Amino acid sequence: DCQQELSLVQTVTRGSRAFLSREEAQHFVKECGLLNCEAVLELLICHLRLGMEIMKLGRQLREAVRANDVDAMLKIAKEIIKVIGETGLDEVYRQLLKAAKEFLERRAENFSHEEAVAFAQQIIQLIKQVECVQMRALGAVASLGCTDLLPQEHILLLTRPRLQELSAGSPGPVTNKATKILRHFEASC
């Protein structure tokens, strides 16, 4: 069922750790076997694309706070809503969707400048938690990729375009981790 795979993906991406525990990785692999493994991998890839767009908006929102451009803060908060609301569900990023809409809804009233910065920093703090979501989604891809559930060439076909976009991004944990996963998938083939 399509709902059970979404519940599996939102569960494995849920946690304070940027790395899956062995029990979380094993349970994720076993539950993928009970569901459609390709449908699970596509949900992770969609999560990885949304997370990449969120961080780029998170960087721009940082510059908006430094430049004290309230209009730029509202424009970016609106783009966070658009990219999240369009791409599938949003149980992960649920708080980010609330704070962005709340920031955008108070625009209907005469809201203060210190009040606008507080929302931007609240959105910036929540976007830092998105970095952990991507590291978890990349870990679920690696756990599924290091198994025989899908052919290695088929695993590479599904994940290479997204893994390349992550590897080309700015340096950091998600860039180095996606590069390492892409190396292993390409080398196995």
DSSP string covering 33-56, please? HHS-HHHHHHHHHHHHHHHHHHHH
In the 8-state DSSP scheme, what is residue 1? -
Give buried/exposed letters for 138-170 (b at 16+ CB in 10 A, else e): bbbbbbbbbeebbebeebbebbeebbeebbeee
Q: How many domains does the chain have?
A: 1
Question: Is residue 77 within 8 Å of 104, Cβ to Cβ?
Answer: yes
SS3 content of the chain, % helix, strand, coil (to 5): 80, 0, 20
Helix (H) or strand (E) holding 16: none
Q: Say how far apart CA 121 and CA 132 lie, in whole Å.
A: 18
Give buried/exposed letters for 97-128 (b at 16+ CB in 10 A, else e): bebbbebeeeeeeeeeeeebeebbebbbebbe
Question: Is residue 55 within 8 Å of 130, Cβ to Cβ?
Answer: yes
Note down the domain range covering 93.
2-188
Q: Say how far apart CA 95 and CA 3 lie, in whole Å.
A: 21
Resolution (A): 2.2
Q: Say how far apart CA 77 and CA 43 lie, in whole Å.
A: 24
Nearest to 119 by CA among 102, 94, 132, 134: 102
Q: Say how far apart CA 155 and CA 183 lie, in whole Å.
A: 13
